[PDB]
Amino acid sequence: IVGGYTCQENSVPYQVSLNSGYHFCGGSLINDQWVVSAAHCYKSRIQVRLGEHNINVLEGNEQFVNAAKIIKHPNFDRETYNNDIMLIKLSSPVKLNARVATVALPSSCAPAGTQCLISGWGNTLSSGVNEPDLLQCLDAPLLPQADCEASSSFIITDNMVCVGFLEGGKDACQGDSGGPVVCNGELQGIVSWGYGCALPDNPGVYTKVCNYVDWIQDTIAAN
Numbered sequence: 001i002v003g004g005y006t007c008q009e010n011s012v013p014y015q016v017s018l019n020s021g022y023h024f025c026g027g028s029l030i031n032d033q034w035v036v037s038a039a040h041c042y043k044s045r046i047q048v049r050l051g052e053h054n055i056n057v058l059e060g061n062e063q064f065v066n067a068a069k070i071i072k073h074p075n076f077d078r079e080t081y082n083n084d085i086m087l088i089k090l091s092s093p094v095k096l097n098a099r100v101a102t103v104a105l106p107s108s109c110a111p112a113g114t115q116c117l118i119s120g121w122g123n124t125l126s127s128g129v130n131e132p133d134l135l136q137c138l139d140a141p142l143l144p145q146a147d148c149e150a151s152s153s154f155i156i157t158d159n160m161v162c163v164g165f166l167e168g169g170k171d172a173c174q175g176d177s178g179g180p181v182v183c184n185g186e187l188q189g190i191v192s193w194g195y196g197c198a199l200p201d202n203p204g205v206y207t208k209v210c211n212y213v214d215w216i217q218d219t220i221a222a223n
């Protein structure tokens with residue numbers, strides 16, 4: 001997260017870190033045994049880390065659980081990142097508490113202008129790379145598609161939504177991928193891609209979770 005602020009410790013209880021020997025993506029806890037992330041974050045094996053604040057220091061609220069099933073959306077397109085969503089079923093249910101909690105799925109597609117919270121342990125620089133120890137937060141609004149593409153060097157599909165600032169300076173970045181965009185207590189987006197990070201005229205692009213509520217529920221029920 002570039003241009004954000006350090007989240008208060010465990011203040012984003014649904015935020016998880018996907019780890020394969022190091023942090024590589026984020027995710028969101030949606031029930032005691034399922035995590036939703038981005039399909040581009042797929043790996044053959046993944047350890048899910050919950051209750052984290054400092055990912056490099058054991059602070060006492062961590063729960064590390066291995067992924068049992070890692071299910072990418074069947075229509076995920078690696079070239080365009082269309083349908084960039086994935087479900088992870090944990091090998092065992094986690095213990096839900098104040099610091100490890102679930103986030104609700106969207107009841108509808110939120111409108112442009114809705115204020116949200118984006119979070120993650122991704123790169124904090126708009127140039128170069130800096131991986132933060134502590135979870136970063138960013139208050140950002142959903143943007144109108146037309147506004148987003150006006151002077152950007154990209155376009156988005158109906159399964160994507162731009163979130164952020166047209167002026168740049170504040171945005172998600174590499175390492176935040178798969179993480180949450182929560183608005184009014186509902187997961188409306190998943191960090192997916194962008195052109196650079198925090199660059200003017202190039203807001204971040206996120207998977208529009210409201211288009212996948214049925215797939216998510218069906219998948220969970222089928223497994």
Ligand SMILES: [Ca+2]
Nearest residue numbers: 054057058059
């Ligand atoms: Ca820790």
